[PDB]
Write a protein that binds this ligand. Structure first.
Ligand code: SFG
Ligand code: SFG
Lengths: 337, 328
C-alpha cells in the first residue's frame, strides 16, 4: 500500500511475459505505432529518440528501422533485461540503448529530437503513466521536438450491453432448459452485475451503442499545465440523443491517440472505439444500478471525471453525474476493477 | 469460513453452475432416475444454493426436502421454492450444515460439493459430516462416489503462447525469438495448479484412474487430511512435447446402469475444466515413452480449503522428479 510496495507490484506485472504478449499480440495497437513512427520518418531520420517505457524494446526498434541515429529505450521493470537481448538479436545494440530504471531519474547524455511512448491504460488513464511521459518531455525533449503520439481524446456513449442483457435474462430461461422456474432471480442478478461501483473492462460493438459518440475531453501532450489537470481531474460534460428504444445499462468510455502526419500531412489515429477494430484495451463500462428504458430521441446528459484513486494513484477512479430523460439527476463513483 | 461462503453470495458463481449444462443435466437425471428410491422419502440437500437440486428431488417424488445453505443465497432459494409452489415440501434452512438443526434424520443426501481438481474448496468434509449426523441407516448418497484421473498432456494453447515470440518477426519485422526461454520460465516454471480446458488431442497417453472415493466408506474423513491419491503408469501415443499432467474427476450416481458425470477432456466440457500440473519446461516424448508417477491431493497447510498437489514423476529413462503445486 506504500509507494515502494505499489511500485513493486506495478513493475512486477511488467516483468512477466503475459502483459507483453497481450500488448504485442494486439495488432491494431502495435501496427498503429509502427505506421505512426514511419509516418514521421522525415523528422526521425538521423535523429535521436527517447522511448519512455520501452518494455521488450519493440517501439525503439521501430524507430531505428525508421532511420533514427540513436534511441534511448528506458524501462523501469526487470523486462529491460529481455529488451537488451531483443535489441542485440536484431543487430541494433550499437545505437538502441536499453537503460534500466524510471524515466524520472534517468540521465541521458543529450536532449532528444523525439519521444515515443505507449503509456495508455484501461480508460486511458489507468496506471497513471502519462505523468512520466510529461516529465520526460519537460526534461529531455528539445524545443519543437516530436511526441509520438501527440494527443489523446476521450469519448463517451450510452450503451445497451447485449451480453449483460443475456446474463440478466438467463434466469427466466432456466425453466425451458431444466423445468425449474428461476425468473425471480433477475432482480438479484441485476444488483450483483450492475449495482457495484467497479469500472468493467469489456468489448462492445456498434450493436451496443445507443447514441452518437461524443468527445468529452482532449489531452494535448505538448501543453504546459496538463500535469496539474491530471491531479484535479480530466473530463467534461456530455449530451446526446438516443437512436432508438432499448434498455440503457450505462456508459462506455474509450479513447483514441493521434500520431502527426509528417510529410504525408495525414495524421494516424489509433482508436479503441467499439465501432473500430478490437484492441486489448476494450472499453471501460460504467453501469447504472439497474437498466433504464429509453426511446428514440431521449436526451441523456452528464459529466465524467477521471481521477487517480486516493488509495492507489495508479488506479483509475471515475466520478459520473448523469440525467436520463425526465428522471432526476443521479451520481455514481467508480473505481477500476 | 465466511470468506468462502461470501463467494457464493454472488450471482456469477451460480450462473456459471446452472449454465454448465453437462453438470446440471447430470444431476437432474441422476436425481430423476432415482425416483423409485426417493419417492415418498426425505432428502437433505447439502449446500442448496439457489435450490435447483432440491426442486429436482421434489419432481422425483420426495415427500420432503431440507435445503441447507450457508451463504446469503439461501434467501434467493426460498424465493425460487415459493415461485415453483413447493414451500409445503421444500424447506430452506440457512447456515452451515454442521450446525443446522434438522427436524429429523433423512433417507437421502444430495450434494454438488466438487471443486477444481475435485477437492479444492474442501466441501466434501461437510457432506461427510452431514452423512454421519443426519443420514438414516442404509440411506442414499447422490452422487455415491468419485474417481480421480491423470494423463500426460501436450497443451496446444501453451505451445502457441510459447511459440508466439518466434512469430513476431513475420508480423512486424522485429525478431523476438530470444523471449522463448523467458516465456517458458514464466508460464511453466511456477508451482501453481492451472485450471484450463483441454481437448482430446492434448492427451498424450491413455488416462489412468489413480484414486476412488466411496463416500460411504468408513474413515474417509481422516484419509482426506492425510492425502488422497495414488500411483500411475502409462505409455505415450506418439511424438510430442510433454508439458505436464492433467488431473480431472468423475462422480457416479446410483443407477436407478450408473449415471456418470465426467470432467474429462475427452468428454463434453464443464465449468471445472481440468487441473493442469506443468513441468518446469517441455520434455520431448515419443511413441511408447513410459511415464510413471504418484499424485497426492492434500489441503494446503496455511489454508485447508485450498488444494495442494504433490507430484512425483519419471519420464522414460530420465531421473525421477518431484513438483509441489497449490491451486492458483
Ligand atoms: N516511469 C517509468 N519509467 C520507465 N518505464 C516505465 C515507467 N512507467 C511505466 N514504465 C514501463 O512502461 C511500459 C509501458 C507499456 N505500455 C509499453 C511497453 C512497450 N513500449 C510496448 O509498447 O510494447 C511498461 O514496460 C512499464 O514497465
Ligand atoms: N458447510 C456448508 N453448509 C451449507 N452450505 C454450504 C456449506 N459449504 C458450502 N456450502 C454451499 O454449497 C453450495 C455448493 C454449490 N457447489 C452447489 C449449489 C447448488 N446445490 C447447485 O447445485 O446449484 C454453495 O452454495 C455453498 O455456499
Amino acid at each position: 500500500r506504500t509507494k515502494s510496495e505499489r511500485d513493486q507490484l506495478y513493475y512486477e506485472c511488467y516483468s512477466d511475459v503475459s502483459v507483453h504478449e497481450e500488448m504485442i499480440a494486439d495488432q491494431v495497437r502495435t501496427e498503429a505505432y509502427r505506421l505512426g513512427i514511419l509516418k514521421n520518418w522525415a523528422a526521425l531520420r538521423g535523429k535521436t529518440v527517447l522511448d519512455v517505457g520501452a518494455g521488450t524494446g519493440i517501439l525503439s526498434i521501430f524507430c531505428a528501422q525508421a532511420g533514427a541515429r540513436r534511441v534511448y529505450a528506458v524501462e523501469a521493470s526487470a523486462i529491460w533485461q529481455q529488451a537488451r537481448e531483443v535489441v542485440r538479436l536484431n543487430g541494433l545494440e550499437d545505437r538502441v540503448h536499453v537503460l534500466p530504471g524510471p524515466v524520472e531519474t534517468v540521465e541521458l547524455p543529450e536532449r532528444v529530437d523525439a519521444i515515443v511512448s505507449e503509456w495508455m491504460g484501461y480508460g486511458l488513464l489507468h496506471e497513471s503513466m502519462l505523468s512520466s511521459v510529461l516529465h520526460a518531455r519537460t526534461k529531455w525533449l528539445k524545443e519543437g521536438g516530436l511526441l509520438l503520439p501527440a494527443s489523446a481524446e476521450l469519448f463517451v456513449a450510452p450503451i445497451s450491453d447485449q451480453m449483460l442483457e443475456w446474463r440478466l435474462g438467463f434466469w427466466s430461461q432456466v425453466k425451458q432448459h431444466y423445468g425449474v422456474d428461476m425468473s425471480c432471480m433477475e432482480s438479484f442478478a441485476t444488483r450483483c452485475l450492475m449495482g457495484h461501483s467497479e469500472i468493467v473492462v469489456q468489448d462492445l460493438s456498434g450493436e451496443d451503442v445507443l447514441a452518437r459518440p461524443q468527445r468529452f475531453a482532449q489531452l494535448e501532450l505538448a501543453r504546459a499545465g496538463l500535469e496539474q489537470e491530471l491531479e484535479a481531474g480530466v473530463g467534461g460534460r456530455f449530451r446526446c440523443s438516443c437512436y432508438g428504444s432499448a434498455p440503457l445499462h450505462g456508459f462506455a468510455v474509450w479513447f483514441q491517440v493521434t500520431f502527426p502526419g509528417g510529410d504525408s500531412e495525414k495524421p494516424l489515429v489509433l482508436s479503441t472505439s467499439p465501432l473500430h477494430p478490437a484492441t486489448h484495451w476494450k472499453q471501460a463500462l460504467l453501469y447504472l444500478n439497474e437498466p433504464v428504458p429509453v426511446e428514440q430521441d431521449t436526451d441523456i446528459s452528464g459529466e465524467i471525471t477521471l481521477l487517480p484513486s486516493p488509495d492507489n494513484p495508479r488506479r483509475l477512479r471515475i466520478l459520473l453525474r448523469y440525467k436520463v430523460g425526465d428522471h432526476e439527476e443521479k451520481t455514481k463513483d467508480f473505481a477500476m476493477e
